[PDB]
Amino acid sequence: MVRIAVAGAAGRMGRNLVKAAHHNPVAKVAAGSERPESSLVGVDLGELCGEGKFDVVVCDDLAKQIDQFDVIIDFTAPASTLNNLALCQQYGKSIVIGTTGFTEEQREQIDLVAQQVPVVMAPNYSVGVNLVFKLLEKAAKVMGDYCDIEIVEAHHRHKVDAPSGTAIGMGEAIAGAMGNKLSDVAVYAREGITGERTKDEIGFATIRAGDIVGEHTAMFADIGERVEITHKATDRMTFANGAVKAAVWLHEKPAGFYTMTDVLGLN
Amino acid sequence: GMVRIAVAGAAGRMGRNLVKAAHHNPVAKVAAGSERPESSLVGVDLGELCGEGKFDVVVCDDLAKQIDQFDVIIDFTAPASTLNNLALCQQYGKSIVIGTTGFTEEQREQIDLVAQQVPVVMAPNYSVGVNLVFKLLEKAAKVMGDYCDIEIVEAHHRHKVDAPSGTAIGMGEAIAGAMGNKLSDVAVYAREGITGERTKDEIGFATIRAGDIVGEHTAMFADIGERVEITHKATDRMTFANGAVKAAVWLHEKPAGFYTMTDVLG
Amino acid sequence: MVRIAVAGAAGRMGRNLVKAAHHNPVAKVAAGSERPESSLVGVDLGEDVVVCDDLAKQIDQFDVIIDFTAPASTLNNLALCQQYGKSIVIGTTGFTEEQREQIDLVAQQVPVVMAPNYSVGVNLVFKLLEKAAKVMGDYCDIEIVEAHHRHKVDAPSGTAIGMGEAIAGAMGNKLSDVAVYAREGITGERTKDEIGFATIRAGDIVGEHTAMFADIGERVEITHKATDRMTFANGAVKAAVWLHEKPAGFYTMTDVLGLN
Amino acid sequence: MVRIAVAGAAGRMGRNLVKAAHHNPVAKVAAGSERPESSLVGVDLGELCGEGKFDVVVCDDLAKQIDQFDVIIDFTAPASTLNNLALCQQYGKSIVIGTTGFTEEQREQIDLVAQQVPVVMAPNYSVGVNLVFKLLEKAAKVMGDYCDIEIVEAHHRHKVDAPSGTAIGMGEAIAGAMGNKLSDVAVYAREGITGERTKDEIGFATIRAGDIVGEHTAMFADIGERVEITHKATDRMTFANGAVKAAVWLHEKPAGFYTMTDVLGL
Ligand SMILES: NC(=O)c1ccc[n+]([C@@H]2O[C@H](COP(=O)([O-])OP(=O)(O)OC[C@H]3O[C@@H](n4cnc5c(N)ncnc54)[C@H](O)[C@@H]3O)[C@@H](O)[C@H]2O)c1
Ligand SMILES: NC(=O)c1ccc[n+]([C@@H]2O[C@H](COP(=O)([O-])OP(=O)(O)OC[C@H]3O[C@@H](n4cnc5c(N)ncnc54)[C@H](O)[C@@H]3O)[C@@H](O)[C@H]2O)c1
Ligand SMILES: NC(=O)c1ccc[n+]([C@@H]2O[C@H](COP(=O)([O-])OP(=O)(O)OC[C@H]3O[C@@H](n4cnc5c(N)ncnc54)[C@H](O)[C@@H]3O)[C@@H](O)[C@H]2O)c1
Ligand SMILES: O=C(O)c1cccc(C(=O)O)n1
Ligand SMILES: O=C(O)c1cccc(C(=O)O)n1
Ligand SMILES: O=C(O)c1cccc(C(=O)O)n1
């Protein structure tokens, strides 16, 4: 059975991850962390959740509990995740990363550690999104060369990064299937006099409001017609369940950089 | 030899666009045009219809009268009229591009039959995007169809007489086909009053008719907690007209058979 | 500081109403009921206060009942309100024509809020639809589209019907004269006056409604999306707060929100 | 009858404006301009429109034809429009402004000249958009205080300004009905680590692609529900017809700053 440490257990995803891992019968909630300054350190993981009591307490540092768990599920902040990634390297653990907003250099660092550590990383742990990446590739091969490509995403008021990791991933899939690099073509803001749109740009627009769990749309626009491919998540549990599945899959897997495409068999 | 095109129903919304499109395609000539026998626009020059100078061709009340002027009929009319033109094609060795929708199950079979002897292109949508969409729907249905609720929604202009659209039905066929089912086994075309709980296997159709919408289609694949939507929007009819004329060009001097836009493109 | 009794506290709505009332800082969860044969009875609302089998036992503890139960149960609570001078927010639906009349009668003596939808958004949307219908309705095609989860038994939705009624009403018409609920086969050309309804049933969708007003060359769409049933709960609690120390009468969400 | 000068007649809007003014029987196409460098100077406005001929040529400067027209319809560039505004003040001629992307100081200049010149100005000449402004006010009064407010717009690839004039107008109407100034609350770009959304902000998102004529959506989002008001324009003629209706209304009006709300009465 896989023993799961939930980083950032009081978070939006953290709470859902605890619930999901608990309810998966091939997984045990073995540990949980929060920020050292946090109000919820010392508390039982059942209690914060409010659902009865497990025999586990929220730790201020996962290093203290390394003998209780095999896999970290990390949906936190980039700095905190790099720490947990180091921890995995030092003590031979695995990690499922759902955190987004990494810089280009941090990503490379993750690829490096992933040579030695078994790592699952993805900007979205839902099945739909993974299918959407495949659909985008096919659309881009057929229409990309002749069309304007735009990505639009919406999320709740609390999301700190823009555009979403998923939006960027969408762009990467699109750019990749056309033989380009996203950073060459991406346009993240349009303000004032932008002039005429270039032929190759991939525009990003970002909506932050309410409690939206997550909507994404990739648009391919020609003259006279357009194609839109859209994903809508309505419950975080969709992500959490997929992450826990990833953790189960990852257990006793050789070190490397794995994506949800690998976990699901969607390549 | 350039393909000589007869435009059935030349005063129609599609007919006018088809005349313009065929004219502007340099590998095609507008050779003939038809209208309803009762029509106000019989006897009139096809150029006066478009405003674009005057061609040397008049709107006929019957294409049989002009059978020596053309190789291919492009037909975006009504099911009955199209079955007539299909017969005409069989009698005089012509080809036909069919854009007409709203055929019954039996009428369609008839078409498959005549298509053994006549070169026939038929499709519910002559735009490139819709065709890409059919392919995308097949990949989505393989991955999500078994566990998801599948719904198709379409919107068109007020004047459209048939519901749901031919394209919507095609979307259904592609979906059902990729899952090993027949659309007529699963399709639900209306929901009214107390329907009870949705069945697992049904493909629901919803239909909007309003304004001048040229055509929106959406296929939705819904699970618990997430949903995927694939959408096509047409904004100008010329998209369809151009694709139809491209089909006519491709069809010229092809052997008899039932061809689709998938074949015309690839 | 309004003291709220939640009828049927173990229900889908009851659970959300408890959460919503608790959350609202101008309201106190004072009491809660369940069916006498119910398991919840005796249990604390924590899952301070216990779930009672009968609200009559707890009348001193509350001012306003929020009732999203069954027509029979709601008529009992309405009688209770009359006997002990309490108020009631009714969210229960499915009442017969006679039952509604009974409610009208009790509402002469009891302060009563009743509405078929308590979400604040939807109620605003009805007002917005009236304004759009007055300006564009005469020359535009009007279509209503709704989407709901797989388990919903009725079509189109009650809200969709309400949107049609508000639109038809603001144009001086009766919805049943213009409504078209299904389009199948050869329908011929759309009529000028019809209001078309399209219905989607899929997944776990809580509820989307869209009214479209379409001309040649442009179109206006007014859309409401519910994402949690808490939206109905929050609005009911807002109605309870407003209803407190109001004189007796039949009030609707239009009155609570001040939409006139 | 009103005599209309169409500034920038070879433009996207210009071409539609010529067509619209022509087809309005209470209006005459009297004059038309273009950039002096332009390929289409000297050409007949009918040739440009591709509808017959009119006894009028595209001028490089409207000053050369001032006696000919009463009202300029200007959907060009901010600098060109300020020139035509000056021209109006000098020769006592009224103007309909559709141009967007003016700076704050340029819009102050326009209010000044509008004391002396009869001026219609609006970011959108369609009826639907104006109704939408009214709807947005009602929604803001009821939901604005407790909801997150977001505006999304999409337009064709060629549009040079962002966000659209119509989007800013939507923001102004929302902010105004809540007693705020849009420049205090507007957020026009979200890039990298933005942190948590503020309570008061009005976020703007902008899509530029294809030949899209114009979609706008104002969203009012709470916890558990959201309300969206959306406008879609599908043909430019919608704008052109409304601009020409504005020109007809503006003729023999006293000098003032007018909007489409005034022209229509709502
Ligand atoms: N890939 C996906 O499927 C997916 C899905 C959902 C969210 N996300 C992403 O995951 C991240 C978290 O999202 P959220 O809404 O749950 O965020 P949140 O702000 O609710 O929660 C983050 C949690 O991590 C905790 N944390 C921060 N630093 C820490 C440290 N050093 N040690 C321990 N705990 C720490 C915080 O206290 C907080 O509880 C975001 O970057 C979001 O974009 C990804
Ligand atoms: N596959 C596609 O890409 C596509 C695109 C557009 C329309 N369509 C379909 O094509 C059909 C036409 O749409 P539309 O707007 O062009 O219709 P429309 O009503 O504007 O025009 C159809 C024309 O056919 C003419 N007609 C009818 N019977 C005739 C006869 N016996 N002989 C000669 N002329 C005849 C009518 O007089 C009319 O002018 C519809 O079935 C529609 O659903 C398909
Ligand atoms: N209010 C509305 O309803 C509305 C609707 C559509 C567009 N617009 C606005 O109109 C403006 C232009 O619109 P477009 O899409 O038609 O632009 P466009 O570039 O297609 O056309 C602008 C035309 O103005 C001409 N022009 C520029 N400088 C000139 C000068 N000094 N003299 C004469 N002509 C000159 C250009 O050559 C060009 O043909 C934009 O700012 C746009 O946002 C407003
Ligand atoms: O791709 C992302 O950035 C993402 C995915 C799911 C949820 C969230 C979030 O809620 O922040 N963000
Ligand atoms: O698939 C269809 O049925 C269809 C496709 C394009 C246009 C139309 C139409 O305009 O009627 N109908
Ligand atoms: O609000 C605007 O700026 C606007 C409105 C309509 C059309 C256009 C355009 O096509 O540029 N721009």
PDB file of N, CA, C and O in Angstrom, chain B residues 137 150-154 163-176 182-192 198 201-209 217-219, chain C residues 145-146 181-184 197-201:
ATOM      1  N   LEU B 137     -13.621  14.582 -32.540  1.00  0.00           N
ATOM      2  CA  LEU B 137     -14.671  13.922 -31.817  1.00  0.00           C
ATOM      3  C   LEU B 137     -14.431  12.433 -31.681  1.00  0.00           C
ATOM      4  O   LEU B 137     -14.735  11.842 -30.644  1.00  0.00           O
ATOM      5  N   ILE B 150     -22.832  12.495 -23.315  1.00  0.00           N
ATOM      6  CA  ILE B 150     -22.495  13.155 -24.570  1.00  0.00           C
ATOM      7  C   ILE B 150     -23.646  13.956 -25.084  1.00  0.00           C
ATOM      8  O   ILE B 150     -24.742  13.421 -25.278  1.00  0.00           O
ATOM      9  N   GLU B 151     -23.417  15.228 -25.321  1.00  0.00           N
ATOM     10  CA  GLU B 151     -24.487  16.115 -25.739  1.00  0.00           C
ATOM     11  C   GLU B 151     -23.981  16.936 -26.904  1.00  0.00           C
ATOM     12  O   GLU B 151     -22.858  17.392 -26.893  1.00  0.00           O
ATOM     13  N   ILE B 152     -24.859  17.183 -27.868  1.00  0.00           N
ATOM     14  CA  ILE B 152     -24.589  18.054 -28.992  1.00  0.00           C
ATOM     15  C   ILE B 152     -25.583  19.216 -29.064  1.00  0.00           C
ATOM     16  O   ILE B 152     -26.811  19.041 -28.900  1.00  0.00           O
ATOM     17  N   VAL B 153     -25.059  20.398 -29.318  1.00  0.00           N
ATOM     18  CA  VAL B 153     -25.841  21.596 -29.267  1.00  0.00           C
ATOM     19  C   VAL B 153     -25.494  22.303 -30.509  1.00  0.00           C
ATOM     20  O   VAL B 153     -24.313  22.500 -30.831  1.00  0.00           O
ATOM     21  N   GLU B 154     -26.492  22.824 -31.184  1.00  0.00           N
ATOM     22  CA  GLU B 154     -26.249  23.564 -32.440  1.00  0.00           C
ATOM     23  C   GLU B 154     -27.164  24.734 -32.564  1.00  0.00           C
ATOM     24  O   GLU B 154     -28.268  24.733 -31.973  1.00  0.00           O
ATOM     25  N   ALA B 163     -34.062  20.200 -38.318  1.00  0.00           N
ATOM     26  CA  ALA B 163     -33.520  20.183 -36.956  1.00  0.00           C
ATOM     27  C   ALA B 163     -33.417  18.768 -36.475  1.00  0.00           C
ATOM     28  O   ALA B 163     -34.349  17.990 -36.674  1.00  0.00           O
ATOM     29  N   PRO B 164     -32.317  18.391 -35.854  1.00  0.00           N
ATOM     30  CA  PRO B 164     -31.129  19.198 -35.768  1.00  0.00           C
ATOM     31  C   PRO B 164     -30.420  19.283 -37.149  1.00  0.00           C
ATOM     32  O   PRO B 164     -30.853  18.657 -38.085  1.00  0.00           O
ATOM     33  N   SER B 165     -29.386  20.102 -37.219  1.00  0.00           N
ATOM     34  CA  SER B 165     -28.628  20.297 -38.396  1.00  0.00           C
ATOM     35  C   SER B 165     -28.036  18.961 -38.866  1.00  0.00           C
ATOM     36  O   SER B 165     -27.891  17.998 -38.102  1.00  0.00           O
ATOM     37  N   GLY B 166     -27.727  18.919 -40.145  1.00  0.00           N
ATOM     38  CA  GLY B 166     -27.087  17.765 -40.732  1.00  0.00           C
ATOM     39  C   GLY B 166     -25.751  17.565 -40.088  1.00  0.00           C
ATOM     40  O   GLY B 166     -25.309  16.410 -39.881  1.00  0.00           O
ATOM     41  N   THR B 167     -25.056  18.684 -39.847  1.00  0.00           N
ATOM     42  CA  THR B 167     -23.733  18.631 -39.229  1.00  0.00           C
ATOM     43  C   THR B 167     -23.823  18.020 -37.803  1.00  0.00           C
ATOM     44  O   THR B 167     -22.955  17.231 -37.382  1.00  0.00           O
ATOM     45  N   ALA B 168     -24.843  18.392 -37.053  1.00  0.00           N
ATOM     46  CA  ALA B 168     -24.980  17.879 -35.711  1.00  0.00           C
ATOM     47  C   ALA B 168     -25.143  16.382 -35.765  1.00  0.00           C
ATOM     48  O   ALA B 168     -24.548  15.650 -34.990  1.00  0.00           O
ATOM     49  N   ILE B 169     -25.950  15.929 -36.703  1.00  0.00           N
ATOM     50  CA  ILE B 169     -26.181  14.516 -36.856  1.00  0.00           C
ATOM     51  C   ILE B 169     -24.889  13.832 -37.237  1.00  0.00           C
ATOM     52  O   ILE B 169     -24.584  12.757 -36.762  1.00  0.00           O
ATOM     53  N   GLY B 170     -24.116  14.471 -38.091  1.00  0.00           N
ATOM     54  CA  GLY B 170     -22.853  13.910 -38.500  1.00  0.00           C
ATOM     55  C   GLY B 170     -21.958  13.776 -37.296  1.00  0.00           C
ATOM     56  O   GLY B 170     -21.249  12.807 -37.148  1.00  0.00           O
ATOM     57  N   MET B 171     -21.989  14.765 -36.425  1.00  0.00           N
ATOM     58  CA  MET B 171     -21.170  14.733 -35.217  1.00  0.00           C
ATOM     59  C   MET B 171     -21.572  13.575 -34.368  1.00  0.00           C
ATOM     60  O   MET B 171     -20.723  12.864 -33.828  1.00  0.00           O
ATOM     61  N   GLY B 172     -22.871  13.397 -34.248  1.00  0.00           N
ATOM     62  CA  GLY B 172     -23.375  12.206 -33.570  1.00  0.00           C
ATOM     63  C   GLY B 172     -22.918  10.869 -34.183  1.00  0.00           C
ATOM     64  O   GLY B 172     -22.592   9.910 -33.471  1.00  0.00           O
ATOM     65  N   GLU B 173     -22.936  10.805 -35.506  1.00  0.00           N
ATOM     66  CA  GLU B 173     -22.571   9.584 -36.211  1.00  0.00           C
ATOM     67  C   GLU B 173     -21.123   9.267 -35.945  1.00  0.00           C
ATOM     68  O   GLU B 173     -20.755   8.120 -35.720  1.00  0.00           O
ATOM     69  N   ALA B 174     -20.285  10.284 -36.024  1.00  0.00           N
ATOM     70  CA  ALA B 174     -18.849  10.098 -35.813  1.00  0.00           C
ATOM     71  C   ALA B 174     -18.585   9.613 -34.393  1.00  0.00           C
ATOM     72  O   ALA B 174     -17.797   8.709 -34.195  1.00  0.00           O
ATOM     73  N   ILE B 175     -19.277  10.205 -33.434  1.00  0.00           N
ATOM     74  CA  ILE B 175     -19.139   9.809 -32.051  1.00  0.00           C
ATOM     75  C   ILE B 175     -19.605   8.364 -31.842  1.00  0.00           C
ATOM     76  O   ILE B 175     -18.866   7.516 -31.346  1.00  0.00           O
ATOM     77  N   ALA B 176     -20.844   8.103 -32.226  1.00  0.00           N
ATOM     78  CA  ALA B 176     -21.406   6.769 -32.076  1.00  0.00           C
ATOM     79  C   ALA B 176     -20.542   5.708 -32.764  1.00  0.00           C
ATOM     80  O   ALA B 176     -20.210   4.641 -32.182  1.00  0.00           O
ATOM     81  N   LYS B 182     -24.690   2.662 -33.199  1.00  0.00           N
ATOM     82  CA  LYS B 182     -25.462   3.272 -34.293  1.00  0.00           C
ATOM     83  C   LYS B 182     -26.208   4.445 -33.621  1.00  0.00           C
ATOM     84  O   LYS B 182     -26.817   4.297 -32.572  1.00  0.00           O
ATOM     85  N   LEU B 183     -26.124   5.625 -34.227  1.00  0.00           N
ATOM     86  CA  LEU B 183     -26.691   6.851 -33.638  1.00  0.00           C
ATOM     87  C   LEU B 183     -28.157   6.735 -33.317  1.00  0.00           C
ATOM     88  O   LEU B 183     -28.592   7.224 -32.272  1.00  0.00           O
ATOM     89  N   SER B 184     -28.931   6.125 -34.218  1.00  0.00           N
ATOM     90  CA  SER B 184     -30.382   5.993 -34.003  1.00  0.00           C
ATOM     91  C   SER B 184     -30.734   5.145 -32.767  1.00  0.00           C
ATOM     92  O   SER B 184     -31.810   5.309 -32.222  1.00  0.00           O
ATOM     93  N   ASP B 185     -29.845   4.255 -32.326  1.00  0.00           N
ATOM     94  CA  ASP B 185     -30.026   3.528 -31.046  1.00  0.00           C
ATOM     95  C   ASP B 185     -29.917   4.406 -29.778  1.00  0.00           C
ATOM     96  O   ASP B 185     -30.543   4.109 -28.774  1.00  0.00           O
ATOM     97  N   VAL B 186     -29.112   5.465 -29.840  1.00  0.00           N
ATOM     98  CA  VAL B 186     -28.801   6.302 -28.678  1.00  0.00           C
ATOM     99  C   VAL B 186     -29.342   7.745 -28.717  1.00  0.00           C
ATOM    100  O   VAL B 186     -29.392   8.383 -27.701  1.00  0.00           O
ATOM    101  N   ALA B 187     -29.714   8.260 -29.874  1.00  0.00           N
ATOM    102  CA  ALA B 187     -30.033   9.662 -30.001  1.00  0.00           C
ATOM    103  C   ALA B 187     -31.319  10.021 -29.297  1.00  0.00           C
ATOM    104  O   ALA B 187     -32.276   9.285 -29.340  1.00  0.00           O
ATOM    105  N   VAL B 188     -31.322  11.173 -28.634  1.00  0.00           N
ATOM    106  CA  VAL B 188     -32.518  11.738 -28.041  1.00  0.00           C
ATOM    107  C   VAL B 188     -32.646  13.130 -28.592  1.00  0.00           C
ATOM    108  O   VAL B 188     -31.771  13.972 -28.426  1.00  0.00           O
ATOM    109  N   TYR B 189     -33.714  13.382 -29.319  1.00  0.00           N
ATOM    110  CA  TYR B 189     -33.861  14.663 -30.096  1.00  0.00           C
ATOM    111  C   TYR B 189     -34.733  15.719 -29.418  1.00  0.00           C
ATOM    112  O   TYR B 189     -34.798  16.851 -29.842  1.00  0.00           O
ATOM    113  N   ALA B 190     -35.418  15.341 -28.363  1.00  0.00           N
ATOM    114  CA  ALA B 190     -36.294  16.283 -27.731  1.00  0.00           C
ATOM    115  C   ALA B 190     -36.416  15.913 -26.293  1.00  0.00           C
ATOM    116  O   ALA B 190     -36.468  14.717 -25.956  1.00  0.00           O
ATOM    117  N   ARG B 191     -36.490  16.925 -25.451  1.00  0.00           N
ATOM    118  CA  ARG B 191     -36.724  16.696 -24.049  1.00  0.00           C
ATOM    119  C   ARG B 191     -37.821  17.610 -23.603  1.00  0.00           C
ATOM    120  O   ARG B 191     -37.665  18.820 -23.611  1.00  0.00           O
ATOM    121  N   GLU B 192     -38.934  17.014 -23.198  1.00  0.00           N
ATOM    122  CA  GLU B 192     -40.109  17.778 -22.903  1.00  0.00           C
ATOM    123  C   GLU B 192     -40.856  17.135 -21.764  1.00  0.00           C
ATOM    124  O   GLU B 192     -41.039  15.935 -21.770  1.00  0.00           O
ATOM    125  N   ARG B 198     -31.644  10.888 -17.062  1.00  0.00           N
ATOM    126  CA  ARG B 198     -30.940  10.676 -18.307  1.00  0.00           C
ATOM    127  C   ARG B 198     -30.434   9.201 -18.330  1.00  0.00           C
ATOM    128  O   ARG B 198     -29.939   8.674 -17.306  1.00  0.00           O
ATOM    129  N   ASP B 201     -26.311   6.011 -22.018  1.00  0.00           N
ATOM    130  CA  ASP B 201     -25.811   5.837 -23.379  1.00  0.00           C
ATOM    131  C   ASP B 201     -26.279   6.888 -24.345  1.00  0.00           C
ATOM    132  O   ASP B 201     -25.682   7.022 -25.459  1.00  0.00           O
ATOM    133  N   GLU B 202     -27.324   7.642 -23.954  1.00  0.00           N
ATOM    134  CA  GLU B 202     -27.956   8.603 -24.886  1.00  0.00           C
ATOM    135  C   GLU B 202     -27.001   9.702 -25.325  1.00  0.00           C
ATOM    136  O   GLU B 202     -26.029  10.088 -24.584  1.00  0.00           O
ATOM    137  N   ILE B 203     -27.233  10.128 -26.563  1.00  0.00           N
ATOM    138  CA  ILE B 203     -26.625  11.327 -27.091  1.00  0.00           C
ATOM    139  C   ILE B 203     -27.757  12.317 -27.289  1.00  0.00           C
ATOM    140  O   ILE B 203     -28.582  12.180 -28.182  1.00  0.00           O
ATOM    141  N   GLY B 204     -27.824  13.310 -26.419  1.00  0.00           N
ATOM    142  CA  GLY B 204     -28.861  14.337 -26.507  1.00  0.00           C
ATOM    143  C   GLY B 204     -28.548  15.374 -27.581  1.00  0.00           C
ATOM    144  O   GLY B 204     -27.396  15.761 -27.776  1.00  0.00           O
ATOM    145  N   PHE B 205     -29.585  15.897 -28.230  1.00  0.00           N
ATOM    146  CA  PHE B 205     -29.453  17.000 -29.196  1.00  0.00           C
ATOM    147  C   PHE B 205     -30.294  18.188 -28.748  1.00  0.00           C
ATOM    148  O   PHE B 205     -31.463  18.037 -28.469  1.00  0.00           O
ATOM    149  N   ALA B 206     -29.686  19.358 -28.689  1.00  0.00           N
ATOM    150  CA  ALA B 206     -30.405  20.571 -28.476  1.00  0.00           C
ATOM    151  C   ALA B 206     -30.203  21.514 -29.655  1.00  0.00           C
ATOM    152  O   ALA B 206     -29.125  21.683 -30.167  1.00  0.00           O
ATOM    153  N   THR B 207     -31.248  22.243 -30.003  1.00  0.00           N
ATOM    154  CA  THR B 207     -31.303  23.033 -31.202  1.00  0.00           C
ATOM    155  C   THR B 207     -31.813  24.448 -30.959  1.00  0.00           C
ATOM    156  O   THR B 207     -32.869  24.672 -30.379  1.00  0.00           O
ATOM    157  N   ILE B 208     -31.035  25.406 -31.421  1.00  0.00           N
ATOM    158  CA  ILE B 208     -31.359  26.816 -31.302  1.00  0.00           C
ATOM    159  C   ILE B 208     -31.575  27.387 -32.708  1.00  0.00           C
ATOM    160  O   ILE B 208     -30.779  27.189 -33.594  1.00  0.00           O
ATOM    161  N   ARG B 209     -32.645  28.115 -32.933  1.00  0.00           N
ATOM    162  CA  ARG B 209     -32.782  28.708 -34.237  1.00  0.00           C
ATOM    163  C   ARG B 209     -33.015  30.163 -33.974  1.00  0.00           C
ATOM    164  O   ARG B 209     -34.006  30.506 -33.383  1.00  0.00           O
ATOM    165  N   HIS B 217     -21.733  24.760 -33.676  1.00  0.00           N
ATOM    166  CA  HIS B 217     -21.912  23.406 -33.166  1.00  0.00           C
ATOM    167  C   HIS B 217     -20.979  23.115 -32.034  1.00  0.00           C
ATOM    168  O   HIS B 217     -19.799  23.476 -32.076  1.00  0.00           O
ATOM    169  N   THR B 218     -21.487  22.424 -31.041  1.00  0.00           N
ATOM    170  CA  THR B 218     -20.694  22.052 -29.895  1.00  0.00           C
ATOM    171  C   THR B 218     -20.968  20.633 -29.496  1.00  0.00           C
ATOM    172  O   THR B 218     -22.127  20.289 -29.380  1.00  0.00           O
ATOM    173  N   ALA B 219     -19.935  19.826 -29.315  1.00  0.00           N
ATOM    174  CA  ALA B 219     -20.086  18.516 -28.708  1.00  0.00           C
ATOM    175  C   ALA B 219     -19.480  18.572 -27.361  1.00  0.00           C
ATOM    176  O   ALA B 219     -18.406  19.085 -27.209  1.00  0.00           O
TER     177      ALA B 219
ATOM    178  N   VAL C 145     -31.758  28.659 -23.306  1.00  0.00           N
ATOM    179  CA  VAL C 145     -30.977  27.445 -23.233  1.00  0.00           C
ATOM    180  C   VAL C 145     -30.599  27.140 -21.806  1.00  0.00           C
ATOM    181  O   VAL C 145     -30.170  28.012 -21.081  1.00  0.00           O
ATOM    182  N   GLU C 146     -30.763  25.894 -21.406  1.00  0.00           N
ATOM    183  CA  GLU C 146     -30.428  25.497 -20.058  1.00  0.00           C
ATOM    184  C   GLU C 146     -29.693  24.168 -20.032  1.00  0.00           C
ATOM    185  O   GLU C 146     -29.891  23.330 -20.888  1.00  0.00           O
ATOM    186  N   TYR C 181     -40.998  23.830 -27.431  1.00  0.00           N
ATOM    187  CA  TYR C 181     -40.203  23.044 -26.509  1.00  0.00           C
ATOM    188  C   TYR C 181     -39.421  21.982 -27.182  1.00  0.00           C
ATOM    189  O   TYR C 181     -38.557  21.353 -26.588  1.00  0.00           O
ATOM    190  N   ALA C 182     -39.665  21.771 -28.448  1.00  0.00           N
ATOM    191  CA  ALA C 182     -38.944  20.704 -29.159  1.00  0.00           C
ATOM    192  C   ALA C 182     -38.886  21.046 -30.612  1.00  0.00           C
ATOM    193  O   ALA C 182     -39.833  21.586 -31.161  1.00  0.00           O
ATOM    194  N   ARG C 183     -37.771  20.733 -31.227  1.00  0.00           N
ATOM    195  CA  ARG C 183     -37.628  20.923 -32.655  1.00  0.00           C
ATOM    196  C   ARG C 183     -37.060  19.679 -33.237  1.00  0.00           C
ATOM    197  O   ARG C 183     -35.930  19.278 -32.927  1.00  0.00           O
ATOM    198  N   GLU C 184     -37.841  19.035 -34.064  1.00  0.00           N
ATOM    199  CA  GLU C 184     -37.452  17.713 -34.553  1.00  0.00           C
ATOM    200  C   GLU C 184     -37.918  17.542 -35.981  1.00  0.00           C
ATOM    201  O   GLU C 184     -39.039  17.904 -36.290  1.00  0.00           O
ATOM    202  N   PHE C 197     -36.954  26.644 -26.631  1.00  0.00           N
ATOM    203  CA  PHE C 197     -36.289  26.123 -25.452  1.00  0.00           C
ATOM    204  C   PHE C 197     -35.424  24.990 -25.866  1.00  0.00           C
ATOM    205  O   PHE C 197     -35.896  24.059 -26.503  1.00  0.00           O
ATOM    206  N   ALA C 198     -34.154  25.057 -25.496  1.00  0.00           N
ATOM    207  CA  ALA C 198     -33.256  23.931 -25.664  1.00  0.00           C
ATOM    208  C   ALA C 198     -32.691  23.446 -24.322  1.00  0.00           C
ATOM    209  O   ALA C 198     -32.387  24.215 -23.451  1.00  0.00           O
ATOM    210  N   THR C 199     -32.561  22.140 -24.190  1.00  0.00           N
ATOM    211  CA  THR C 199     -32.308  21.512 -22.924  1.00  0.00           C
ATOM    212  C   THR C 199     -31.113  20.527 -23.012  1.00  0.00           C
ATOM    213  O   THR C 199     -31.137  19.611 -23.821  1.00  0.00           O
ATOM    214  N   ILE C 200     -30.125  20.708 -22.125  1.00  0.00           N
ATOM    215  CA  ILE C 200     -28.957  19.843 -22.027  1.00  0.00           C
ATOM    216  C   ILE C 200     -28.937  19.133 -20.708  1.00  0.00           C
ATOM    217  O   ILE C 200     -29.224  19.709 -19.665  1.00  0.00           O
ATOM    218  N   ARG C 201     -28.672  17.842 -20.749  1.00  0.00           N
ATOM    219  CA  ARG C 201     -28.620  17.078 -19.528  1.00  0.00           C
ATOM    220  C   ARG C 201     -27.314  16.367 -19.523  1.00  0.00           C
ATOM    221  O   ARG C 201     -27.116  15.483 -20.318  1.00  0.00           O
TER     222      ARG C 201
END
